[PDB]
Design a protein around this ligand. Structure first.
Ligand SMILES: O=C[C@@H](O)COP(=O)(O)O
Ligand SMILES: [Cl-]
Ligand SMILES: [Cl-]
Ligand SMILES: [Cl-]
Lengths: 249, 251
């Protein structure tokens, strides 16, 4: 067996003993060194998604480069189950999840619904917009997600990449954020320390989603991945040896 | 990973079909996706390390697939002794694809040692008779006879004949005799029978019987027929391949 000779089976067993994980899927290599490893995580994640699909599916997705790799490897479902894709969230104050969710849907021969992309407005304007019947319909669809597919990032990297207010950068630093996922920053114990001003999915909502698949790897993410899974998330992690071996040794 | 990708079942099907000691299959098709050759390299390396003894004499062939094995080689964590030797040579490859080049790269990457052997293919009878008696050549031939492992590729006959410097007379022979696969300078027909042997120093086909660990690394859809034909006879070999080849073979 390939997974036996590469040592992945024993490694996945141990990663699941260590982290709060429903299951672990580890591909060979370190994506920080070998770019194509992101594509193999993509392949593995798609295969995992397809094993979990029910007859009808609403799949919420995030917008980072590893989820893009999942979209690129997406293929139509052999079982022809019904597939609607949506972004898990949209920022307030470009939505990259929108791009990913459209690409993934086209690749799966599914359908999708995107979130509005507003200019800079007052809170009152945003509050009025989210109650608009057309917008509310997409938010309710996101609330009904049967699956979430998301990345995990280093906190400082994510906060700098965005256009994060100086007040919030200080909050993020001062509260020792180390990891980021779906618009939330968490500390080393996996506790929320800051949330991006967003619409769509909230951390409390993940509890009710039957299938959550986190796709994240590379040796530079070992600490972020460990922190995120310091609490139970009922999540299957698709990762690589880069991250898994650095975490476990 | 292999579970969700269906690779675990594919490997069992392939191992049975070809009578292999083991089959290891990686995701995708190296004909569409170049990185897949790198993953075959990685899996081959793991395979080699699983089978290393305390002291090792590893015979290596050339070609771009074994070069990918070399590229993916890393030092042994158990720090076992590793000497790499080219299994033959004088096969008419450009230097970049010669066993003598690949063996040295693999040794470097493994932090092992290596022996050089360069004896080109089209020496006169007199020059060839004289060169094979030179101490450096005789010594390395003896080392090759002692190989504890062989790592080799498998090619399509036509593809190999074309890439190599193959004399007009021998192309006809390879074609007339319906060769469909090639390995370490032997061309075989669909039944795994030798139909043309390249004259060269070093390991001969009968010698592989005494090598206890043989790892064949070859993939891509274009190779399914060649892989099938090579394994028509018992080879006591582990095959490292990809979805591109295995799925087409079992089609
Ligand atoms: O003898 C078989 C190999 O040289 C095949 O070369 P390749 O790995 O470039 O296909
Ligand atoms: Cl790697
Ligand atoms: Cl991502
Ligand atoms: Cl839409």
């Amino acid at each position: 067996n390939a997974k036996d000779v590469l040592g992945l089976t024993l490694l996945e067993k141990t990663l699941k003993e260590r982290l709060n994980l429903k299951d672990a899927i580890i591909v060979s290599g370190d994506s920080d060194q070998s770019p194509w490893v992101k594509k193999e995580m993509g392949r593995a994640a798609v295969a995992c998604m397809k094993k979990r699909f029910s007859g009808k599916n609403i799949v919420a997705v995030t917008g980072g480069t590893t989820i893009e790799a999942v979209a690129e490897m997406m293929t139509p479902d052999s079982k022809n189950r019904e597939l609607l894709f949506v972004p898990a969230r949209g920022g307030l104050g470009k939505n990259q999840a929108n791009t990913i969710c459209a690409h993934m849907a086209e690749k799966a021969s599914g359908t999708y619904r995107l979130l509005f992309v507003p200019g800079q407005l007052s809170q009152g304007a945003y509050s009025s917009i989210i109650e608009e019947p057309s917008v509310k319909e997409v938010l309710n669809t996101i609330k009904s997600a049967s699956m979430l597919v998301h990345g995990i990032g280093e906190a400082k990297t994510m906060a700098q990449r965005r256009n994060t207010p100086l007040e919030d950068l200080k909050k993020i630093d001062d509260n020792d954020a180390v990891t980021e996922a779906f618009g939330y920053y968490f500390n080393a114990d996996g506790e929320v320390v800051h949330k991006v001003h967003s619409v769509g999915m909230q951390l409390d909502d993940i509890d009710a989603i039957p299938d959550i698949i986190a796709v994240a790897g590379g040796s530079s993410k070992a600490e972020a991945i460990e922190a995120y899974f310091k609490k139970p998330r009922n999540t299957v992690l698709v990762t690589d040896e880069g991250a898994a071996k650095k975490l476990l040794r």
